[PDB]
Design a protein around this nucleic acid. Sequence first.
DNA 1: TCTGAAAGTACTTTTAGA
DNA 2: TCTAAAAGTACTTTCAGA
Lengths: 270, 269
Amino acid sequence: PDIATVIDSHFEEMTDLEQEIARYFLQAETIQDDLSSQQVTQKLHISQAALTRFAKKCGFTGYREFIFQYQHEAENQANQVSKHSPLTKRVLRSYSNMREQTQDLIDEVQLERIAQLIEDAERVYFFGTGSSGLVAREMKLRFMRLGVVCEALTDQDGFAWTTSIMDENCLVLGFSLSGSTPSILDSLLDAKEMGAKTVLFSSVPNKDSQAYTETVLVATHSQPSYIQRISAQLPMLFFIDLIYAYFLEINRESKEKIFNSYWENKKLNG
Amino acid sequence: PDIATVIDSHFEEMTDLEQEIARYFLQAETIQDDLSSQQVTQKLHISQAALTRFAKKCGFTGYREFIFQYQHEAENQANQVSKHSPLTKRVLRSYSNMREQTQDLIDEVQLERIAQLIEDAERVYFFGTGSSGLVAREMKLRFMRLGVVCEALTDQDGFAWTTSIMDENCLVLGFSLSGSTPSILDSLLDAKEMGAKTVLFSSVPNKDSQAYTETVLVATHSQPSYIQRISAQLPMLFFIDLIYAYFLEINRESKEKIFNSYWENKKLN
DNA sequence: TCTGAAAGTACTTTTAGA
DNA sequence: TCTAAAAGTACTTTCAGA
Ligand SMILES: [Mg+2]
Ligand SMILES: [Mg+2]
């Protein structure tokens, strides 16, 4: 929490003097002042105990700890190259809000189970379109390095052909940020009718979306207008890296040897 | 710099007594002890002045600021939901850690100029390989919907062909997370010899090879071991979204008309 | 209850010795 | 130079008074 908001939240519970002491600290210039208790007491014409009491009601041990957070945020605000604009802050907000929204939707028992489904499957398949298609290509690169036999598909023709060759040892991961993409939903259903296990990634909850073996609910974008939203890959990439971390710990010793052999052949071929 | 390196960077010039104090605070478990001066004084058999002298040696006013800097970082370290597993915790930090670093690496006036560079450019190209290739394709999708004439390329055979058809009104953006990819660096130079403006995205700083119009510094992965690092697209994804935001407000109404036209005609009519 | 004033204290400064 | 101990202080705690 920004200290400007921390004083704001701890406002209506403060005494009249401290409510005025806050008003000085909410001022923008205040950071450039001498902020020692001796100076602040003379400038605001108060006692040093008043500063301690004001900091205590803000949730601090005393004025020394309060002024440290106040100065620490400013030094962290001044450690940047440029001072950021509302546009710069809005884009960073969408990343952090998605991180916190994803964090609220984390289903640990589901994620390991899906990671287990990848391990047990002989062949793993990735269906996506647009940005979701690029997400599918990312997981294909990441997991093939660990020894998973996998392929990625990105068009309707690719989905239909791959489904026709699936069996009970196949697994398909479907990506649909909107949750209503026609090619993703049908082909995943077509995969199920061939015995393949199916997992769907979406940001919308759907009652009939219980058809697939697993259904991972991902975060929704912070911006309301579509044109202003951040990268559409991010809602799934959070869960991509989670399932990857869980999947890596299953037979970690053997999987690392597969990774290092993959990395050796690539790096040494200069 | 975290509290770990400031003690690491501030070590060799410390006296023998304080160097023991350094390792005491550098050990992971010491966070849980009573970090008051007296308790630490009793544990280490030192003087309370020694703690103040040690803390000033780290660049602080005294022991009070050191502990608060020490304990606040742990408060920053464990303000997440304390229910998840260590696996879930590590991934969520690496996502945040990249965002913490990215915000500090932002050069707003540089990103604005790049956003202007794409608008003024008649043709824009995105070069990348592997994960960097996927980022290039992602950026191609976002800007094409706004009316930018662009193509994305992911192999060196594509890079060489494109460089032949480029001129002074072309602009190419190369993505190389390592900063030492031969195809990205060489083809970027071939673009400049054709008169086009060049922008390079890299996590390693390089003003030595300031041959490109702009060089954008992206965040580095929090995990030290390669196998455990999160998606490699994240350092690029932060800056492409920022550049997209600045570009969007340039002739916003006309950009929005094209964007709605894109979804109208390229979505089952 | 609430404020400043006085007494108290976790550290901070000064000091003397090795 | 370096340290602990002594001396000092920037707040912190205690507490009369309105
Ligand atoms: Mg003495
Ligand atoms: Mg004085």
